[PDB]
Design an enzyme around this catalytic site. Structure first.
Site, PDB file in Angstrom:
ATOM      1  NE  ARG A  34       2.519   0.580   3.530  1.00 47.14           N
ATOM      2  CZ  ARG A  34       3.678  -0.047   3.677  1.00 47.14           C
ATOM      3  NH1 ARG A  34       4.028  -0.525   4.873  1.00 47.14           N
ATOM      4  NH2 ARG A  34       4.510  -0.183   2.630  1.00 47.14           N
ATOM      5  CD  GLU A  71      -5.842   2.146  -6.649  1.00 44.14           C
ATOM      6  OE1 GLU A  71      -6.377   1.037  -6.393  1.00 44.14           O
ATOM      7  OE2 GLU A  71      -5.916   3.147  -5.912  1.00 44.14           O
ATOM      8  CD1 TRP A 104      -7.006   9.022  -2.026  1.00 47.32           C
ATOM      9  CD2 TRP A 104      -7.972   9.441  -0.037  1.00 47.32           C
ATOM     10  NE1 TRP A 104      -6.021   9.530  -1.177  1.00 47.32           N
ATOM     11  CE2 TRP A 104      -6.595   9.777   0.049  1.00 47.32           C
ATOM     12  CE3 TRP A 104      -8.790   9.625   1.090  1.00 47.32           C
ATOM     13  CZ2 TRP A 104      -6.021  10.263   1.222  1.00 47.32           C
ATOM     14  CZ3 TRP A 104      -8.215  10.122   2.265  1.00 47.32           C
ATOM     15  CH2 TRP A 104      -6.845  10.437   2.316  1.00 47.32           C
ATOM     16  CB  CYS A 128      -0.916   0.039   1.234  1.00 43.37           C
ATOM     17  SG  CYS A 128      -1.875   1.562   1.287  1.00 43.37           S
TER      18      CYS A 128
HETATM   19  C1  HEM Z   1      -6.283   6.629   1.866  1.00 45.61           C
HETATM   20  C2  HEM Z   1      -6.005   6.338   0.576  1.00 45.61           C
HETATM   21  C3  HEM Z   1      -5.325   5.098   0.081  1.00 45.61           C
HETATM   22  C4  HEM Z   1      -4.671   5.022  -1.094  1.00 45.61           C
HETATM   23  C5  HEM Z   1      -4.514   6.181  -2.070  1.00 45.61           C
HETATM   24  C6  HEM Z   1      -4.169   3.699  -1.214  1.00 45.61           C
HETATM   25  C7  HEM Z   1      -3.481   3.244  -2.326  1.00 45.61           C
HETATM   26  C8  HEM Z   1      -3.348   1.888  -2.598  1.00 45.61           C
HETATM   27  C9  HEM Z   1      -3.024   1.345  -3.888  1.00 45.61           C
HETATM   28  C10 HEM Z   1      -2.867   2.176  -5.148  1.00 45.61           C
HETATM   29  C11 HEM Z   1      -2.933  -0.010  -3.771  1.00 45.61           C
HETATM   30  C12 HEM Z   1      -2.653  -1.037  -4.878  1.00 45.61           C
HETATM   31  C13 HEM Z   1      -3.982  -1.687  -5.323  1.00 45.61           C
HETATM   32  C14 HEM Z   1      -3.925  -2.463  -6.619  1.00 45.61           C
HETATM   33  O1  HEM Z   1      -3.027  -2.194  -7.452  1.00 45.61           O
HETATM   34  O2  HEM Z   1      -4.772  -3.369  -6.875  1.00 45.61           O
HETATM   35  C15 HEM Z   1      -3.174  -0.303  -2.388  1.00 45.61           C
HETATM   36  C16 HEM Z   1      -3.091  -1.574  -1.880  1.00 45.61           C
HETATM   37  C17 HEM Z   1      -3.503  -1.840  -0.585  1.00 45.61           C
HETATM   38  N1  HEM Z   1      -3.962  -0.948   0.348  1.00 45.61           N
HETATM   39 FE1  HEM Z   1      -4.019   0.967   0.257  1.00 45.61          FE
HETATM   40  N2  HEM Z   1      -4.532   2.956  -0.158  1.00 45.61           N
HETATM   41  C18 HEM Z   1      -5.196   3.745   0.704  1.00 45.61           C
HETATM   42  C19 HEM Z   1      -5.844   3.376   1.897  1.00 45.61           C
HETATM   43  C20 HEM Z   1      -5.901   2.096   2.448  1.00 45.61           C
HETATM   44  C21 HEM Z   1      -6.616   1.707   3.603  1.00 45.61           C
HETATM   45  C22 HEM Z   1      -7.544   2.640   4.398  1.00 45.61           C
HETATM   46  C23 HEM Z   1      -6.300   0.368   3.851  1.00 45.61           C
HETATM   47  C24 HEM Z   1      -6.808  -0.485   4.954  1.00 45.61           C
HETATM   48  C25 HEM Z   1      -7.139   0.001   6.169  1.00 45.61           C
HETATM   49  C26 HEM Z   1      -5.405  -0.068   2.792  1.00 45.61           C
HETATM   50  C27 HEM Z   1      -4.816  -1.318   2.664  1.00 45.61           C
HETATM   51  C28 HEM Z   1      -4.270  -1.720   1.431  1.00 45.61           C
HETATM   52  C29 HEM Z   1      -3.995  -3.146   1.173  1.00 45.61           C
HETATM   53  C30 HEM Z   1      -4.200  -4.315   2.121  1.00 45.61           C
HETATM   54  C31 HEM Z   1      -3.520  -3.224  -0.089  1.00 45.61           C
HETATM   55  C32 HEM Z   1      -3.084  -4.496  -0.827  1.00 45.61           C
HETATM   56  C33 HEM Z   1      -4.229  -5.194  -1.592  1.00 45.61           C
HETATM   57  C34 HEM Z   1      -3.764  -6.487  -2.246  1.00 45.61           C
HETATM   58  O3  HEM Z   1      -2.735  -7.084  -1.882  1.00 45.61           O
HETATM   59  O4  HEM Z   1      -4.465  -6.999  -3.150  1.00 45.61           O
HETATM   60  N3  HEM Z   1      -5.184   1.024   1.995  1.00 45.61           N
HETATM   61  N4  HEM Z   1      -3.397   0.870  -1.670  1.00 45.61           N
HETATM   62  C1  5H4 Z   2      -8.626  -5.938  -7.647  1.00 44.94           C
HETATM   63  C2  5H4 Z   2      -7.345  -5.128  -7.571  1.00 44.94           C
HETATM   64  N1  5H4 Z   2      -6.929  -4.786  -6.184  1.00 44.94           N
HETATM   65  C3  5H4 Z   2      -6.545  -6.007  -5.429  1.00 44.94           C
HETATM   66  C4  5H4 Z   2      -5.860  -7.124  -6.249  1.00 44.94           C
HETATM   67  C5  5H4 Z   2      -6.533  -8.487  -6.024  1.00 44.94           C
HETATM   68  C6  5H4 Z   2      -7.696  -8.606  -5.257  1.00 44.94           C
HETATM   69  C7  5H4 Z   2      -8.313  -9.841  -5.047  1.00 44.94           C
HETATM   70  C8  5H4 Z   2      -7.777 -10.994  -5.596  1.00 44.94           C
HETATM   71  C9  5H4 Z   2      -6.620 -10.896  -6.360  1.00 44.94           C
HETATM   72  F1  5H4 Z   2      -6.105 -12.020  -6.894  1.00 44.94           F
HETATM   73  C10 5H4 Z   2      -6.005  -9.658  -6.576  1.00 44.94           C
HETATM   74  C11 5H4 Z   2      -8.002  -4.000  -5.510  1.00 44.94           C
HETATM   75  C12 5H4 Z   2      -7.487  -3.054  -4.430  1.00 44.94           C
HETATM   76  C13 5H4 Z   2      -6.937  -3.546  -3.243  1.00 44.94           C
HETATM   77  C14 5H4 Z   2      -6.467  -2.648  -2.280  1.00 44.94           C
HETATM   78  C15 5H4 Z   2      -6.560  -1.282  -2.514  1.00 44.94           C
HETATM   79  C16 5H4 Z   2      -7.124  -0.762  -3.684  1.00 44.94           C
HETATM   80  N2  5H4 Z   2      -7.197   0.590  -3.962  1.00 44.94           N
HETATM   81  C17 5H4 Z   2      -7.518   1.563  -3.100  1.00 44.94           C
HETATM   82  N3  5H4 Z   2      -7.149   2.791  -3.277  1.00 44.94           N
HETATM   83  C18 5H4 Z   2      -8.279   1.095  -1.921  1.00 44.94           C
HETATM   84  C19 5H4 Z   2      -9.326   0.171  -1.702  1.00 44.94           C
HETATM   85  C20 5H4 Z   2      -9.570   0.071  -0.339  1.00 44.94           C
HETATM   86  C21 5H4 Z   2      -8.796   0.870   0.526  1.00 44.94           C
HETATM   87  S1  5H4 Z   2      -7.682   1.769  -0.451  1.00 44.94           S
HETATM   88  C22 5H4 Z   2      -7.580  -1.676  -4.631  1.00 44.94           C
HETATM   89 CL    CL Z   3     -10.168  -1.079  -8.062  1.00 45.39          CL
END
Ligand code: HEM
Ligand code: 5H4
Ligand code: CL
Ligand code: HEM
Ligand code: 5H4
Ligand code: H4B
Ligand code: H4B
Ligand code: CL
Lengths: 362, 362
Positions: free
Chosen positions: A68, A242, A237, A65
């Site tokens: 953070r 994305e 947000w 993320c």
């Molecule tokens: C406040 C604005 C936030 C922004 C701009 C942001 C941005 C992002 C982005 C761009 C990703 C990559 C997602 C992808 O490519 O599919 C991401 C992943 C992630 N974010 Fe954040 N995030 C934010 C807030 C949060 C919050 C509030 C949480 C949880 C409390 C969180 C937990 C995560 C997690 C767990 C992932 C990894 C998802 C995965 O492995 O599939 N984020 N974030």
């Molecule tokens: C579907 C693409 N992203 C996760 C990738 C994924 C999800 C589920 C299964 C997979 F194999 C791969 C979605 C994602 C996850 C975490 C953050 C965000 N983007 C955001 N800005 C936020 C979403 C929630 C808090 S921040 C998008």
């Molecule tokens: Cl998305």
């Protein structure tokens, strides 16, 4: 072995959490309370303070993320009291409304009762609370292909989508003791959507693109001191890439780059013209412009990386180890224009954290 | 332990190489020859076939290289016969001329005598045979900052640069038995350079940018069956992003994006305008256009990734394990538009290969 893993995770989390909260002197007695509670019940119940700080730590430890910096301002809603499907529905509806906040998005998580025997109390089927359906018929694709299997599963349960490219999926979740999930159509008054227009190119609206305002991930497990909160939807947000560089651009998603090239007036014929790169930049400019114009929160990848640099500086000054996944932190456009690309990150897993879990369908 | 490492690497390389060359029956007798040669001399000498195939395998095993589809067409020049500094100079001059080939670049490597006691026979100081000098004075930067320390070391040896932004460094290398390297100015008739212009924006030439045609890496060690060829310069052609997205764009290199924004007519004021991304795309379009117009080989990152996909398919069909470094293979612009971004790669080190070695200055 189960009580043992639980007790070990509990000791580690409580010590760390209470140390951060300036409550180190209370650790010994709280751990005693916990140990006997585990002895007698097989589990333990977090205080409101532990649960809230636990969710914030989990965000702080999310290696992938970039957002953070703001981990400590997470809004934690405690819904461990829910027992009924109406209560779950109303809590999900509420999360959408309060997180959305008229466009000024508030990072929020709603936490439902945790697994017990590894037995889920509430099982949420949606990947995000707001997402678009996807369909395949006659080899013809409609909507979001990433939603194809869940869309098919909802239509198995008596839901029917209109088959536009932007059908909102219903909320779908299962209660402990029920054999099938229930589904509830989203009230449209709760869902902000943004039409995609371009600041300079009028024809861009001919593409009729839009996206939803608030991404609310509802299929990851929050783990805090050995307790498994499999149902704990959370939102921030969007970072504009994305939407503009992946959701709308990927060939296996909305696949819009050729159409973008066409409305911005460039040929999509030769790799050496870098038409995909140019289309990507204009689409991403349009996404940021469109969210800003509508008054919906969004961050560009340059600003997000600058914030992340501050998060790194903050970790160092707090004496906390920083962990990160370089392959996910770099943005998918101009990544070498960010500092992230030029350094490395320890990808170790630290708990509390958010984790993938198996889908209940497919 | 030294003869032992050598013998082990030798056995592995010869078996693999002769198997690839359809000469498996010759392995036993060749290995006998080798074992006694090591016993008697402490080393062994590659046949011309081994050396050539060894260099090609080494390219094939370079995890960070996107251009590996063409590994089997490497032009290998055997200069293990050189003994004098004039001979080294003339071999480096020749490499430049034959690799350049009037703009139609030929992937070439010239291989000099290998280390003996870990004692180098020829020690090349240049990072690339053709590169630009860099200077810092009055806190004012001139030329290529990545060349600052080597530039300073050359000026210690009686060379003096003109302090333009594009001074060609002399060849600089040391012979075994000499305390100091010698240096030789490059004949300008051997060095192709490309002025950077844009296909549509006339003002782009106001930036007076240029780059050299042929990147010839001259500071890596080629390792083949336990023999350390520390002096073995090699070249391909450029992928356009190396120039447009890094050499000319990085803040710690030529840092041209603000100037690019200005000549293409966009504001460089707001992160949300994605002006850096847009500047990057136009600069990269100009680089590809300029090389093509001059008739100098170059590849864009989309075509390069398509070629790399073929390399992957070729490895699989040949039954060879593929290795790769995902963090270097993704291009620094629009990486998610390539297939590379969406799969993973085993980053194991396989020999023969090219390796970093310590710089002899600084
Ligand atoms: C406040 C604005 C936030 C922004 C701009 C942001 C941005 C992002 C982005 C761009 C990703 C990559 C997602 C992808 O490519 O599919 C991401 C992943 C992630 N974010 Fe954040 N995030 C934010 C807030 C949060 C919050 C509030 C949480 C949880 C409390 C969180 C937990 C995560 C997690 C767990 C992932 C990894 C998802 C995965 O492995 O599939 N984020 N974030
Ligand atoms: C579907 C693409 N992203 C996760 C990738 C994924 C999800 C589920 C299964 C997979 F194999 C791969 C979605 C994602 C996850 C975490 C953050 C965000 N983007 C955001 N800005 C936020 C979403 C929630 C808090 S921040 C998008
Ligand atoms: Cl998305
Ligand atoms: C024919 C055209 C070629 C292209 C287009 C190509 C492309 C590239 C690119 C873009 C890089 C990354 C460089 C950087 O970012 O600094 C690279 C790395 C590399 N290439 Fe190739 N390459 C080609 C030929 C060759 C040849 C002929 C060899 C050797 C025989 C070679 C060996 C390597 C090695 C060793 C690296 C890694 C350098 C490092 O780790 O610092 N390549 N290649
Ligand atoms: C200086 C940037 N690149 C290497 C990175 C490096 C080099 C030396 C020391 C470092 F710390 C880091 C240069 C490089 C290396 C390999 C290939 C290329 N690009 C090419 N297309 C080729 C050059 C030679 C054959 S292909 C550039
Ligand atoms: C294989 C590769 O690691 C994978 O496809 C990743 C690359 N980096 C990513 N980074 C982000 N933020 N999101 C993604 O979906 C991906 N895909
Ligand atoms: C830390 C990071 O791995 C490093 O800065 C890399 C990233 N990927 C790269 N990839 C290429 N091709 N060239 C580079 O110089 C770099 N820099
Ligand atoms: Cl270079």
């Amino acid at each position: 072995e189960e009580k043992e893993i639980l007790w070990n995770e509990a000791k580690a989390f409580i010590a760390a959490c209470y140390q951060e909260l300036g409550k180190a002197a209370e650790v010994k007695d709280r751990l005693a309370d916990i140990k006997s509670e585990i002895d007698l019940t097989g589990s333990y119940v977090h205080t409101k303070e532990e649960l809230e700080h636990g969710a914030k730590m989990a965000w702080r430890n999310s290696n992938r993320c970039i957002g953070r910096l703001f981990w400590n301002s997470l809004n934690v809603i405690d819904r461990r009291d829910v027992r009924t499907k109406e209560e779950v529905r109303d809590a999900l509806f509420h999360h959408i409304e309060t997180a959305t906040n008229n466009g000024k998005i508030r990072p929020t998580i709603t936490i439902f009762p945790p697994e017990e025997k590894g037995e889920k109390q509430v099982e949420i089927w949606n990947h995000q609370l707001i997402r678009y359906a996807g369909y395949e018929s006659d080899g013809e694709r409609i909507g979001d292909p990433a939603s194809c299997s869940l869309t098919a599963a909802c239509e198995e349960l008596g839901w029917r989508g209109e088959r536009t490219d932007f059908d909102l999926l219903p909320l779908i979740f299962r209660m402990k003791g029920d054999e099938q999930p229930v589904w509830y159509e989203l009230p449209r008054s709760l869902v902000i959507e943004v039409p995609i227009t371009h600041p300079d190119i009028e024809a861009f609206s001919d593409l009729e693109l839009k996206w939803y305002g608030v991404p609310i991930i509802s299929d990851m497990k929050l783990e805090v001191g050995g307790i498994h909160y499999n149902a704990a939807p959370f939102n921030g947000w969007y970072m504009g890439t994305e939407i503009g560089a992946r959701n709308l651009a990927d060939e296996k998603r909305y696949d819009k780059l050729k159409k973008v090239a066409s409305v911005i007036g460039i040929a999509a014929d030769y790799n050496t013209d870098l038409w995909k790169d140019q289309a990507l930049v204009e689409l991403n400019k349009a996404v940021l412009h469109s969210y800003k114009k509508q008054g919906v929160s969004i961050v560009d990848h340059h600003t997000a990386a600058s914030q992340f640099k501050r998060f790194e500086e903050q970790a160092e000054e707090a004496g906390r180890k920083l962990t990160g996944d370089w392959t996910w932190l770099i943005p998918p456009i101009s990544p070498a224009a960010t500092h992230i690309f030029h350094r490395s990150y320890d990808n170790s897993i630290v708990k509390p954290n958010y984790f993938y879990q198996d889908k209940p369908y497919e």
